[model samples]
Target chain A: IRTNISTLRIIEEPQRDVYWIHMHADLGRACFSTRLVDDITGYQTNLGQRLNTAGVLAPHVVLASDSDVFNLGGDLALFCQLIREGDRARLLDYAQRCVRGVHAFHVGLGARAHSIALVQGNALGGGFEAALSCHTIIAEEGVMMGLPEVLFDLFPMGAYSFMCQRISAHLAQKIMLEGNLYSAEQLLGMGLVDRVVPRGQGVAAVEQVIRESKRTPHAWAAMQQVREMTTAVPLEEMMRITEIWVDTAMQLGEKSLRTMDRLVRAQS
Target chain B: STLRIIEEPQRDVYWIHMHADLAPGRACFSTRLVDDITGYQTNLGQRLNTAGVLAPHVVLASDSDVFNLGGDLALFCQLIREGDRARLLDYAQRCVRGVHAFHVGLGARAHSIALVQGNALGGGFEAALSCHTIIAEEGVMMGLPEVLFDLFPMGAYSFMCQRISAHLAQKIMLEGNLYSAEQLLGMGLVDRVVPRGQGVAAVEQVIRESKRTPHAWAAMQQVREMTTAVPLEEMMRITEIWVDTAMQLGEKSLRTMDRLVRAQ
Candidate 1:
């Protein structure tokens, strides 16, 4: 019972426009660097000015990786060092920085643009989370991805919220707890990835998606906005879980550290 | 009153009894009913703001065998024939506000319960789906029949897709089918179905047990918010699609809508 809610105004487009952000990790692990986190955070922070000045120049913004792995997600070596050194504040600082990107990606950066993730390589841990945050996800076949934090004692704080919103809550819980790596085909069947193409054909798939948008740009634009409205994530949830994560890490004993340390080595 | 409100502060139970005053006692969301629902929500929010009590269970029940026929077809027939998409969208938005309020626990910490003791069809069934729990009685029938009018269930389709499978929800909508409460119970759409005339007793016990563990209820409510939330904006957006499709319905569709009106 309420007053009433209402609207759609579609802007004519001359051509299909897309903006791409490519990231790479030279150290072999594709986890986000502090510079990249700061970069994403800074980009989102200035979106208001960017939109006001440029006026939604590109209706599609894509995030992709230049290397063989999309992203490893989370700096496990850094986490180990912080945990080993009891640097709780720095841990919180880094987590809050990650939340900034999660919040922006989930909301489409407050522009008319749709956020997309192109996964040509393995997306693991936080890597999987970043892709999940995007409006649409396209992956190449043979790509391996999942939330693997629970392989140890810890769970994924960022992915926990985003996964539950994007996918079913039961499935989100099961995947995180199981910590199993899934192939792109398996993920496509599970509703995790939107489209799966043959290896190295990701650009074509993304182009098709963009072509569909260009045809029904109005409806597509409205759909993206409404989805954000429906599954909007609150910063409080991410922050609360982040705090819990930092607390748990700070409280890890030597035994847990040894196991986590070995877990990091196995990945190398 | 088309809408009757009863609050038992001690038990934290708020009852909303729907008793339609027109049309052969078939409870439908007439303009009068929608306005009264608005009044009820405004009053409830006012009470909440004034340091009044909170209802752990906001129960919706009906006083007739036909819970709600939904979408007063006469107005719809009138609006469609005249090509009034604006008014249709307005009506759609109003319908969504009420349903979405229930989905969000009426804008506070509460549990919305649907006490369906009779048939709930069309958008009325959608209203029941909006609630946190559906406590239906035996012999109750409920379904979405919007397809017959060359239209769809709007926000109801999204709600069903989230609760059940999208494929199943699509099938039911495409056929304009009707389903019995018992059948829906097995489908997990209806939470519980008691004996006929026993709906009133069932809801009270449900509320009592939920109140017994307030903390768990709160946590579960949070879980629900993070999980299966269908926001007001989403509902409004879906209503646009409903209105747009309804505007395209020609002579055959209007006649079908009128047929239901005359049939009732």
Candidate 2:
């Protein structure tokens, strides 16, 4: 079960109210947005497993993807194959597991430290979902963020409930259901992402934000209260919505499947 | 029945209370009492419309436990019993015009505050919404809750929806959920929740604050008009309906008789 451990080097400069985690993940292997989401999926699962086996609380820690693509959203290609072969149970199970993993990330982050997502480049489908799981988002103005699952006869399994707390359901429906790719300006107006900056400026903006966040006393406790208030209803609603969405996805017609196949190949 | 003016000299504000129980005399207070105030305040509109004149920071209040019981249902029921459609409509129109005058009299020139010391149910709550600033006591309850009475809140519901979140306004109007002071604070419906005995004091504090920045207050007025969806005339039109429709129910209204006979 052992995998080569990679270190997330933490750079601390107390005087500046800033810290940096230099993440290095090969782009060829899996890069989830540099300095934003570092791929820690393997580590996250291993940590959970060890904690359960040891019967101890996992030490307070922050786990995230350091790549430019934030774990690439559960290998959509794998899900596409499951659908292309009409593996209904597997598809549903995978989607559910993916959702569970997504929830674990959000819950873990809330439990550990305040989470920040600094989106750069295209944060499409699951990447977008991952970014949204964070507490606050500092997205690049040019970064594309959306739950593009429904377009491919699939659906976003996570964040159905929490999204409304961040933005209005009307807008969320249009984007997630209608498959619209909203710009940073549109997202900001909808009150989704906290702050949008120029592309490549996300890290600096996040650093400034993080600095202020640390200086503020009772930061952790305040964030926990905010998390409790915002997510309590939305999480319950999202779990139900995800179940319904998964059923709907399972019921897509032959034309829907053919259309998606055609779409993937044609686009490729 | 007259609306007795209890002036708080300390606050430099007057608490215009209904001489009768507003809930019992729903019709009279909603229609007659409001009309009386309108009659007194109507011409005062031009004086109050101190858009450039003497800027007055006035707080509109009532003596009843409830701010208002809604338009004079007694008058409404009487017209309904008489089956006089045309007269009912006219009476309704009068109330509407009076409510409009109230809206203009308060909203146009001065900074009007609605001090809700007790429950502001139905049209009572609507009247409070009509004011620019609403300050309620901690023990005060507020909501449209008219849907429970087999009626709809025609006027203030629109304003409430526009001013607050659409979801909450819809729930308050459509679902008839009663809102406590704490609930309203969470929704930003009630501006400030003062201690039960200190509602007037809190409002006076605001009046003092407004007096300091009269020009700043004017700018805020302009900002609100610029941002809101409907014009002031539209709000008046909506309040107008509440007045006229409620008038037709007349004497059949139990709330009205209760107010007429209640000991002040």
Candidate 3:
């Protein structure tokens, strides 16, 4: 149902209510800031309808991408450009796109299905937020995850919204402010990741969860509703935070941009 | 005989004891214990918040191996058999009030803690979960096993989800299995697990640590509650469901309750 999306590969399982949406970084960048947002937006707008037919639509959508990295986070290059030009509108536009994808993933794209993130490598900043947005997160051993926005003197939007639902707000703030990378084991211990699998067994681990979830669809479905009932963030609040994010982005100066540039180089 | 309230002015801590002997070698929550706790909490809440009381930490614990054998299953069965829906609902609401007050820190700017030194089943587990921090001793058992009697735990579902995922909470409620302190600690249900004999010491240590930034700690508690506040209406609705379900329990379920009553 999809074509010409270079950054994403959508694989639909035959005769099953499961699909895999793999995120590939453009030009081998290994991140999920803007381009992945575009791919996700495109899928939700274009092919999402085609896959929504009753009894044909996949009820389990997984975000598993190829790399030694799950996602290195935002497009710091783009961030550098927008912040330097003081382009508040365009910066907010980028943030809006990011939160849209995150919110959709959090609510399972409004398909009444389940969303899962499989992390086989490092997931930083927005990448970590994307993983947190999913209903379930299964990461392999030795994988590193963190929110490093504070390193550049910026806070992550939607991170607190997603994380506070699972962990305490204090812990969420600490993780963001520290800008420290944690292993999958650490995140699992903190109740952020649902399951930790062997390094090469990420896909198999996700399949096992799908199999188990299918056995108790009623319980799983009820849980989805209950989670929403208990801890759901409003989209308007996310957009409001995104606006602040743009303002904060514009506040970053040459020193901060240099840190971002260093990270970008580290990304490649 | 069921309620023992001790005040440690030096530590600024108050210990509420659940030591009622509904039967030999077993501790259970009788109506008197419920009243005593709620009344004590009401007075303490006002003093700690406004009257400037010295005891800022309240710890609820038991003197027996079983923390408190949940609700009075025998009384529940008797009322259900007598078709006394009002009495059943009234008792349930009384229990809810105590737990809810504790859940919201007794309307006081102090910390409420549950020191589980032994098994805490059903309503007892719910009460422990209601506290901001649950300090359980090693190798202790705790769970919500009311579903075994065809009656769901009324307010436990709400409190459990506040600490862990709804999926895990549902599984715990449905499975009706007992878990060790370590296991529940892994699930984030139990806040801290101390050695079996170190429960009181652990609470003291925690209290001493918390006393450093008392204002910040209390403010953070308020913020946490404000963000994750479960509506009272939802809990009441679920309690109503529990009442109806109790009234409709079959003989087999009643028999299970009878066994549990005897076990208590």
Candidate 4:
């Protein structure tokens, strides 16, 4: 009974407990809009409780977008404004809100379900981090993804923690600091992206993965739990990074802010 | 000396070829080999102050056909039959100690690399997994075949899970399937898979690439260990379980172990 989420559309399959959340863009540019994050978090919380009580929680959740862009990441324009106003409280609030959404995606909305990200186009900064949070990432060829926070003198809070879980810590550090866009195939070769399908075949590849996982549901679920136990990224740690992020963000000088503004214009 | 140290003083790289003469085709981590590695560590420490004395890249390879045939199963079978659990556990502890040293880069600034050129089964494969980076040649078969004999991989469970997902670790341990180097590379166990006879060159390429940002490489290595470290106590506890399990093996499993010993 999902209703009235302006930024995302949740479509459920009847036979399997699979739900596809197609994120819609704002003014032709998809992003992790503030309202979109809140709506997703709310939906996750409600579905998590409902599925827990029903005891039918292999509910696979897939995050995707209808536009060519998965997401342009956070609203840099808003961030720049907030920082200029010296609004520490508001900045921290925004960071926390972003963390809630990211943490939810990272943990499959706390439902023990398989979370997947299907990226067909550009996924920058927080957008890139959101994709990495999922258990599996299926990207189409030609899709560009990277964390460009360092260009603006800001470190990605959520991305760093999640990336370390997927690749070597050193590789993660290098990717974060390098601030370069990478192709899906390159990411796959590096073991960060699970699969890289041909352009326009992202949906088929994700379905294939789901079908294969369905053949061994128990094993798949067990692996998910094992991942949690072995490579844990505590929510507390993420929140602490958020505070640091907000503080560091406030110290961004005029030059960095200009770069951020340029990035913002590029996103549009 | 159980190992031949091929020192590349110019490149700051050392290639250690395990060569246990007891079994020429199969290299087991015999007492001599362990002692040799310990000696190498000692030399590394003393040479730290010596400019260009010890290399920062320590690559473990093999002179024999098989990278390693695992532990001395003959000694293990004998210990199990005599009900010498303490000695068995002690042996396992030593194995872990050596593996841990490779895992932590021998406590030197160097990074450990495993270049598997041939079949690496049981504890041999586990030893390869303990390294910070693994580069295996094409067509080399690798696996932890401990389950086939009613025993489990004790120390390997920790080492394998740190490099790969825990589920794959459990599957590899339970299924006892011998996988190819290519397959292990896909599984995230092997970092690099090169053509046959190209394993050393592949390692050299990696060394060159790492030299570009040596400090970043070093820092990341430390971060990796700190983040994914398996507690020594946990490994010891698992070894205890392994020893207890070994004692309970019946005639059938012992026969299987016998065949493996002969195979080695």
Q: Count of backbone clashes for each model?
A: 1, 36, 0, 0
* Candidate 2 lDDT over residue span B1-264, tens digit each: 566655443433445565454434333344556566666555445544643443365567777666665545555556666676676555555545544443433455456678888777666777777666688888788776555544556256555654556776676677877788878876756677888889879887777655543433443343334333245567556645654555444343445444543532
lDDT of 1 at B187: 78
* CAPRI rating of model 1: incorrect
Measured against the true two-chain complex, the DockQ scores of the candidates, in the order shown, are 0.03, 0.02, 0.03, 0.05
Most accurate candidate by lDDT: 3
By lDDT, the candidates rank as 3, 4, 1, 2
Residue A1 lDDT in candidate 2: 75
Q: Report the poorest 10 consecutive residues by lDDT, candidate 2 chain B.
A: B220-229
**Ten-residue stretch with the least lDDT total in model 1 chain A:** A1-10
Worst 10 residues of 4 chain B by lDDT: B213-222
Q: In angstroms, give how far residue B89 of model 3 lies from its true place.
A: 0.6
Model 4 lDDT, full chain set: 0.76
- iRMSD in angstroms, per model: 8.4, 21.5, 8.8, 7.0
Candidate 3 per-residue C-alpha lDDT over B102-140 given as tens digits, one digit per residue, 9 for 90 to 100: 777787756788999989988899889878779999999
Off by over 4 Å in 3: A1-160, A165-185, A188-268, B9-11, B20-26, B52-55
Clash pairs, model 3 backbone = none
Query: In model 1, where do residues sit more than 4 Å from their true spots?
Result: A1-268, B20-25, B52-55, B222-227
Error of 4 at A99 (Å): 8.4
How close is every model to the real structure, measured as TM-score?
0.53, 0.46, 0.57, 0.61
Query: Which candidate has the top score in TM-score?
Result: 4
